[PDB]
Ligand binder design. Structure first.
Ligand SMILES: [Ca+2]
Ligand SMILES: [Ca+2]
Ligand SMILES: [Ca+2]
Lengths: 235, 235, 235
């Protein structure tokens, strides 16, 4: 029912549902099967940084994932977002674990959105660097929690710090985002998040996604594991 | 969620979402991107007439838009409607304005529907020539109002008579329409409306559409402007 | 809205919506227009048996329909079910009549499901041979009733025993069925039902279907006749 446009940071190869046989970064339009993929050297217990860029003039959604003293992964896909998405949207961060487990910790999250009309510019900008327990400007869904160490824990984490299996969680910004109207000439957004993925066992599973969805968006049933908390099925 | 079959009278070229670079008439099946288009000479402040025809033997939806002492536009598309639509439907008129503004005035609206079984015929026919403030046989949605001058004003119009921007309105007939059952051999409908599109500025925007939808049809969120009050997105 | 995967037992040729010009058995994935069909010699007033087989290793849904001292019909299609369907599902039996009429009597219904994980095995098995009026492990929908002669009557049957036209009925098992989670290596199901189709007139209509759908599944509006109580439209 819900329209999903996602930038995907994928840690587990799910070759059964069209993933490549390595950890990867993907662009998702209405489907878990990514429209474009790039090879991604995932680093266990290291702080990574993701940048997401789109504008309506380029008609391209672009993504870059970097680790310090390490490789950088880059993905781009030609997509017209006001053609795909409704007038008003909600932006968020989503994560999942399956059988294999990982921490899906967000250390910081910033987002800027701009909409230019025919005749100065309309803008929204938010910045999180510390997350509060009483965080009224976020819609927490599923197993997602804020407050421990000043961080957003999207998947379930025990008292000691070890990741829990079969978890799903999303955090969405409270205010709806304006991506198009009839008067619009230019539309753009920039998204930035720093993340920590650590796993005790050999294979970490599934990962984190930045997503754009319609205002009334909720976690689909059984979207744990490979479906990343975004899609009800693997179509 | 809603299945839409529309004949659109499109006044503004939205080349961004698949429109030709002129005012046009189109046949819409589940999408804003018309399946067939024809060039239409829109006349500002003039009374026009639209005729819409379909039967299940032809398997063709056809439309003709005419102005007095002027050009006539013709569009036809091969479509099987009982294959596309449910057993029971609601018929309506829809209109929108964006940044640019137009009056979406309906002066008269008539509709006939016929369903033929094995071994005479089942029929529904309604005729509006004057519209009432107390109009219980219509479902008014959005900015749609009846009563001033005996006309249906689909988009918002001020006290003086000037059209208002960013408006959306639909009028639907109260009784559900039977378009097929298992016993059926022939199914047909004829639709007719007279309309007034006037604009003070150079470019009138978006226009009027006749539509067929499932019974519980509602105006989608952000279907102002280019989406004509019919579609949630531009897919 | 609902995802439907059905094994179809089709008695009436609806060539208008993509059926072959004979009684047939089909595999339905999201659509009434079968992905694979086989010719099936329907026998009026005779007890038939259907067997449905699928496993995730084969990636094939197969079906066999047999009558005593008569022809056997066989259909197979390459399909990945956990790619198509959600994690948790409900299994059921569905039937319809149109203008022409048939009894859609189920004499017995058995279903087995298996889910094998990384580490023995998770399983569900139910067997019906006699049906009760007070049947709490079934969700009866539409015109479907249990109790007459210890049988499930999916379509409406009169006091004397003659089939009634324009009927629709479904029976679903109460407990949800697990067909995948991430830990899974192999998932399988076997379905079996015995059936009685009798008609006084020359043409019996539409028939019975075994189906897999999401947990909250209900009968679509106007899914009588050709649509088999499964699909809202003939897409
Ligand atoms: Ca994956
Ligand atoms: Ca347009
Ligand atoms: Ca049929």
């Amino acid at each position: 029912a819900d329209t999903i446009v996602a930038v995907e940071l994928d840690t587990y190869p799910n070759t059964d549902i069209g993933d490549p046989s390595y950890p990867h970064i993907g662009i998702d339009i209405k489907s878990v099967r990514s429209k474009k993929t790039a090879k991604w050297n995932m680093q266990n217990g290291k702080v990574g940084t993701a940048h997401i860029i789109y504008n309506s003039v380029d008609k391209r959604l672009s993504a870059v994932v970097s680790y310090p003293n390490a490789d950088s992964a880059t993905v781009s896909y030609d997509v017209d977002l006001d053609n795909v998405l409704p007038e008003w949207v909600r932006v968020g961060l989503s994560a999942s674990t399956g059988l294999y487990k990982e921490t899906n910790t967000i250390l910081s999250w910033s987002f800027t959105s701009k909409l230019k009309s025919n005749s100065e510019t309309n803008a929204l900008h938010f910045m999180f660097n510390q997350f509060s327990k009483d965080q009224k400007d976020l819609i927490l869904q599923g197993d997602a929690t804020t407050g421990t160490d000043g961080n957003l824990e999207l998947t379930r984490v025990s008292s000691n710090g070890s990741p829990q299996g079969s978890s799903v969680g999303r955090a969405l910004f409270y205010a709806p985002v304006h991506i198009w109207e009839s008067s619009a000439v230019v539309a753009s957004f920039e998204a930035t998040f720093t993340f920590l993925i650590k796993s005790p066992d050999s294979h970490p599973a599934d990962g984190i996604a930045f997503f754009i969805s319609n205002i009334d968006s909720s976690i689909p049933s059984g979207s744990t594991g490979r479906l990343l908390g975004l899609f009800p099925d693997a179509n």
